[PDB]
Amino acid sequence: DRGVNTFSPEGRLFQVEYAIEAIKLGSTAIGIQTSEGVCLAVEKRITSPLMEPSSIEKIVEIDAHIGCAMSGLIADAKTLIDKARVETQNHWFTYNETMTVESVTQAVSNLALQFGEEDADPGAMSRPFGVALLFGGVDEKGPQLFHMDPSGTFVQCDARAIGSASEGAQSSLQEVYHKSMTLKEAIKSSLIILKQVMEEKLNATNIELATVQPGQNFHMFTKEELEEVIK
Amino acid sequence: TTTLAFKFLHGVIVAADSRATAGAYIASQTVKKVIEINPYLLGTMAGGAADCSFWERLLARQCRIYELRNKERISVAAASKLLANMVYQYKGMGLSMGTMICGWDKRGPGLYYVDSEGNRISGTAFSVGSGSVYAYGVMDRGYSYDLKVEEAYDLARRAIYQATYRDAYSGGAVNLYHVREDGWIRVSSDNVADLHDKYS
Amino acid sequence: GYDLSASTFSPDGRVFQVEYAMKAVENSSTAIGIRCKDGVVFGVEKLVLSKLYEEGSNKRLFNVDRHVGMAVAGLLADARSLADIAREEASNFRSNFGYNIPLKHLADRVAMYVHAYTLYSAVRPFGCSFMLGSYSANDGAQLYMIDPSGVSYGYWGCAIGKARQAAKTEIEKLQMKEMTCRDVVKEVAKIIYIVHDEVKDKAFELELSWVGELTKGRHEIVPKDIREEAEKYAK
Amino acid sequence: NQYDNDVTVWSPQGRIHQIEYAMEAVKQGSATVGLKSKTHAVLVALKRAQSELAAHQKKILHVDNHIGISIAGLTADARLLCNFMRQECLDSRFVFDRPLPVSRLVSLIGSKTQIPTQRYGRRPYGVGLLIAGYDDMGPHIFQTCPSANYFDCRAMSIGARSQSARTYLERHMSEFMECNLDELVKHGLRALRETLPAEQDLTTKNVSIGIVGKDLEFTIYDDDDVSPFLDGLE
Amino acid sequence: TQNPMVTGTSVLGVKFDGGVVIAADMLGSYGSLARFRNISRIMRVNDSTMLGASGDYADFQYLKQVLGQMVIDEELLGDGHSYSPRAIHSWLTRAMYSRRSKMNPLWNTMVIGGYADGESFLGYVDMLGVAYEAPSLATGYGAYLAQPLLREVLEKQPVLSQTEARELVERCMRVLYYRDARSYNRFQIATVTEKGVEIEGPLSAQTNWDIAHM
Amino acid sequence: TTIMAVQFNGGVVLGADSRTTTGSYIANRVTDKLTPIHDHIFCCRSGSAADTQAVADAVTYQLGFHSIELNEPPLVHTAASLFKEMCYRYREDLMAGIIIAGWDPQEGGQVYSVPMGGMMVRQSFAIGGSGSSYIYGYVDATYREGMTKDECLQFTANALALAMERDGSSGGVIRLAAIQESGVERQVLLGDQIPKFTIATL
Amino acid sequence: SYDRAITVFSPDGHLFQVEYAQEAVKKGSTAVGVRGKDIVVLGVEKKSVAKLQDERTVRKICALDDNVCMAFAGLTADARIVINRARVECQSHRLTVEDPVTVEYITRYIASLKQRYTQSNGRRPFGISALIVGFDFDGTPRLYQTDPSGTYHAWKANAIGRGAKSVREFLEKNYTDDAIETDDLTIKLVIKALLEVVQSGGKNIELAVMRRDQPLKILNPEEIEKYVAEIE
Amino acid sequence: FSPYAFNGGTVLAIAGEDFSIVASDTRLSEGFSIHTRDSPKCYKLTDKTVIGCSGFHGDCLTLTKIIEARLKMYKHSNNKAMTTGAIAAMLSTILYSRRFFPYYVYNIIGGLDEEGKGAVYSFDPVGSYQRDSFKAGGSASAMLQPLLDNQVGFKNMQNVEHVPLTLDRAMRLVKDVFISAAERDVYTGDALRICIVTKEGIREETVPLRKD
Amino acid sequence: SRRYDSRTTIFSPEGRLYQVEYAMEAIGHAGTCLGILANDGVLLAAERRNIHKLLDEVFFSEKIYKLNEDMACSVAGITSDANVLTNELRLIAQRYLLQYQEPIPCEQLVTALCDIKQAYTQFGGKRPFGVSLLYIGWDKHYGFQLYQSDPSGNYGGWKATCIGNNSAAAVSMLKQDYKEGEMTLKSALALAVKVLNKTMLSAEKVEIATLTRESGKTVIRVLKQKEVEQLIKKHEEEE
Ligand SMILES: *[B]([O])([O])[C]([C][C]([C])[C])[N]C(=O)C1=[C]N([C]2[C][C][C][C][C]2)N=N1
């Protein structure tokens, strides 16, 4: 038996390595960054017809200009999502201005490795958050998509896919995405890629798409909107 | 300071003067005593400029965070209750603020008065500030629940005008707001000097 | 299984963890200390692991006070924190009693702090040994040595590190007592050139620090000119 | 099998397996070179990237106007240490109203990283740092590791396959002092290129440059700002 | 320290061509009583810095030991870096303000005189944390009596010589002995140049009492 | 209260009155103000009786423990530094006017003054208490360098006697102490043995 | 105080402690839930139906507020702690906001506290699942389900505890838009679901309905016997 | 024991469409004596923002140091310099943090906004603030405010065409109002420091005043 | 430190809590305690496991304790754990009476002690209380009551129950002998004696306590040696 802060022989924290393996069992969420806004789409994955699909919130609102798509242990992501919401609200109170997308991802990545048994307090994490996040927003630099995992490493990507079928989805984005692709073109690409890697026939109640454009705010496609692009 | 608010048939009317003083000296005459919490929430300020500004800004940050978690706009009763509990912690410490929360939630228009002392009451017509006594006179006199929008704007403007004429700590311009079901709108911002030429 | 914690005795009555911490001091470079008629000379053979390092990097000689010196062996990270612990004790003592802390008391105070890491499971014993040298008009020339177990003793000529059993036979031929400080420096640099292995080890820088009447009771690093000449005498 | 689980467990050979495993974390990171002349200090970091649509991770970070660092190892750990160094530099400018000497800031990092390797339940910082700064004693290039040890070097390289870069720096170190910024930044770029595989070569999107000198505050060149230095290498 | 006990009077300070000169009388007053007539109120921080404190003497002795440790601590590292007169002044300003913000200040008024990197530095820190730099300083009752004299010489001759500044300091000390009821005719004169900090004294002034016969 | 300490070649000479008054009433007319901190280190107490006793006990404890660890006779300056620390630390809570005087192998006979505020200054002779104000001019005009251990005892007895007559808070007997390298020698001066000065009469 | 990490990840990215907490929920009594139009029902199987035990002191259905009530499955001792903490939040929500809590708000709080115990030091995860059922201010019946991990979902009809899969499959094929048409109809669908995972159902079933603008109403044995006769 | 000291000093701030002038006297005083004759109350925050403080010098020296550190920390996490409006909003929260032991400082931030037009923010001791065109704070704030109102704001004038505030006309106005404040206020005198914030950086001008 | 840890509050593969289950095994090897609810009162018939020819009688009882004015209890398990538990029960009842100035209801008291028992099985890393309790009392809301409690923190109200040595054998006997709703104190004592004998008696090997109501006052009393002796003889007449 080992402690939570134990390094392996290859130089990797065991706990973090197992937390990254827990994100391969979560739903897939494809994010595509363009010049006219960011687009996020997640696979809801309902396991029962009695289960209400509107209670599954894989994509949340961090602020008016920032969205968030998560994968892996959804319950652990509720603590990271609240930190991000309080961080962007705190920034506004102190500087009277919106926080940048990279700044929000940085503040959420700081808690990633904040865990341990010894030399800790009552309200301290005992393990790492087994969840990955896809931050998409619009600041002074325009549309920006960020990715944060259990290790606490946040990087920027033009197109990212996290979840169970990430490997298959990531490759399908590498040859269908270009720098001049429109936001409407990105929404179709994501939907097409999502439909391929999914088990259940994609429909209006299965997935959940969200978009954040320069002049607009965070927006979640409804049933009607989703149906339009589905056909 | 002179701020008034009253809810008639067509929503809530909010009016205030724009003058800050540093004793006998008139610090400024373009101060905004009405702060916007959000599109359906208004907040007036009276008393300590730094006190009302910092605490109403703190309430606005609390209302935005509340709407992200519950995925819905906060009510006028909850907004005032939030602010009331905030200032209660520092009760009898020097805080000086007399705000009025107005908005249009589920139960129609709502107008609450919240001071630093501890008060938190709901009503149909309030008036905070050093010139509030003068504003009450004109307000009540011309107040009617079936007042027309144009007639309500006149009443609110005339009420702040007479209060700035009698009170030395009230002056500047007269900012008028109108809260509706679709959200509050900035009616006007007439200057007191121009109002004096029209009422004479 | 009786050697995983410092708060465990083995059947024979030994604390294996503290014995394992002494193994780290026997893997480090050799540092010697010689006390004479009016001072203490520290000689540490700094083993340069790379050519990219600057001449003077990773020093093993620090001034814990203005009259006290400190040569170390074993882990450097642990020894650096012990040097800062010794500085605090020396500084706290001057602000309480109003004068320089005696070497005997400073050694004992720092040895007691080192012995506290050899009793619990929450911490591990320091993996380093060190010598403390000083000079005082009222006292004289003192030289103490503390190991990983927290034991501090007085000496005439001490030696720690890998080649300490071979460096102690070279210091036994010297008559330190009657010897001065300028004559000892040479002998100190000669013993470090004899015990140092030119085969197993590579390049090595010779460090030299002293403290006595010569430097008016102030511990310093031996002057470049005097160090350069002493290095030529060794060769 | 039972001596490599805790940092407070000395092994029979007199070593701490946990600290040795923490030094492997720095060995998995991308190479980062750090050399200096007599008036400048340069840190050329080779950025990495997973997917083709992903951006290159930042390797060079701001600490102060006279201090800059290059990371190699745990991303999160690096940030943690960077915040401490930034706070330490701020305190020095607030109290003494002057830049904190680079060497004095390196001792603060060595003490903060030593504590964790002696307490039970804690772990060492899994990251290596290459600090480039300039103060009253000229330009410096320090190197800190997971085992709370720091070295004062004329040139240094840490990360994956940094032995190829270190070898190159060891034969060109003599001609570093009397050499202008332009030539000294290209001397480090050549060393950073040596660690890379034979095929792929340095570009303007996988290389980061950080310079600090006697009459220049720490600057970080990334995309279009590194072409100037890049142009001039075979 | 809400109420000072044994206090010191004014401390003079004037920058000259190649250094700074500081003077202070050696007297510890207990109210109106001259209790201790041989206490040094000037301390040499390091090779390029000197300090002269007025006010509560117990507070000065606490600062003297808190500063001495700092200098000693920095010299143990031996990395070449050393605290400059401006860095010590800054440190004192933060220490005075911090104490004043906690409603428990060190009742003192310091005059920091130094000489580093070819520049003469003359700082001034009071108990409230108020600090500034000037060509000539004077604390206590010296700001009303000696300050006017020092300022009247630096207006027609901005740059002074070592001998000229020293001759001006003696004139100010003599004037302070005629009008300050808490001063002694025994003072010290510290000078910081390129060679270091040097303290002389006790010295005295040449008082004349011709007006007593008229 | 009228305490006094002077020094000579060998060591030092201490002296104090013995009156403890609570208003206009003498609660203790034979108080022993001279307190031994160590073998060759004494201290005269002045100010608050409860404050000086508490501090002296604390210092005596700290000095005893410090001297047992160092295995050497404690320095008089060390004892004075300890006193100064507590006097300065709790200057807003204590009311003391301690005068540390002893003898050590290093510096010999030393006299230290630690007034109310908590400052520490070494002098050749020191006077403290409420009755020391009346003998300030006397000690300045009578003290001469080179006084022997016998002249110091007569100098202290003369000054204390002069302060006891003018001060209402000073009186009773006179407790002297001569500390040298040989040891400490206490001595009390009662009625007839107390120096007398003819009161000016017409 | 204890600060040991109880719940930690494993080689396959699993959280064993939470998986063992879900194993304890499977050994609990079956708790069924069915959302109707103007009535929410809750059914709980009574395993230990001893004749010498006051049945009012050992119920699985509780009321958090006047519009919210819940049922559980797993360790009874833990359910009590979770039920009383949720009751304090309902009273706290009423003190801060004039209106009463919504079904989802309290479900979110109950699930958030469960996730909190699966990631803190010195504690172990809760071994219970909850079926929070109630009505909002709009009159919209609600039904949520929280589990040991801390995740909750809205449902139309769900079952928890031992043999929850068998009952869930029966609800999927039986829950239509005609089975919950009338008050009695919705109550009869809950009693039918419990009849496939119980022995001689009728005297071992305890259900409580919750109509609009009305407090929790526990139907006694006599009333439950009348419903079993109509399902024959 | 009083933890505050009135040190005097006045600071001015006028905003244009392409510039922003922030001026202040350089005399530090206490009671009736003059501490130093060379103590400007203008501090360069960023490349387009200058802060001016007056009042208790101890708080001015500390507030300024805090602002300098807050700007550095903000640039480290946000990777960009703080704007004039963000520096004004942050100062409000810093002044109000010490609400029960407030800084006796009168701050007047002057710089350029995002668009590029001059911006002036006036602050109160506890933290309250607002953006205006011109502002005067200090010991001569009541002596200069009325003049700026008339001259720059064109108040109480019936026949004026309201000519745009040029940078050359504003430079004379700051010099003129400070020459009148040195004739009446005993805390204003000796030297006037003028900082001009434009798009080409911050320029500094120094003019002498009365010494009596 | 983490190797010596026994991990008491930890789940197991089956989803059970070992420590709590091992504490339940220790309660099955303790003196049999039985409680019966009647119409005019409730009693506690526990068997004494502390029998010897050299033991003193000193105290008023050995297993049955008084919580407050209208409540009593009988423990079964670790003797030292009950001393801690019953002392805490008295504190809870005094704290409640100091707050509302009324006797604490029986179910509220039992519930409060169960919250403490369940806290030792979820966090703290300490072993659980190895004791099972039986409570009898009277309140204005439900009158006479009888509750049981185990080491896990679980509790429940009963009419007749038994904890200890032969709980399962005694419980079965009570099941086929308890006339629910028509039981009197006098007829309940027979039941206790009848069940206590068939699950093990002398008048010194057992201890009985009854709780009845007299003139708006709860009366708790332990039956005397003679008082019990007669009961034992009357059961022999029917055998
Ligand atoms: B009003 O007159 O109440 C007005 C309302 C504010 C602007 C929202 N208040 C002020 O004018 C005002 C005055 N002061 C302080 C008075 C004491 C000196 C410092 C200013 N604060 N707000």
Ligand SMILES: *[B]([O])([O])[C]([C][C]([C])[C])[N]C(=O)C1=[C]N([C]2[C][C][C][C][C]2)N=N1
């Ligand atoms: B002396 O007069 O200063 C003397 C010095 C002491 C004895 C060390 N002080 C006192 O006379 C004195 C008396 N008291 C108390 C007053 C209240 C009643 C008890 C005695 N404190 N100091």
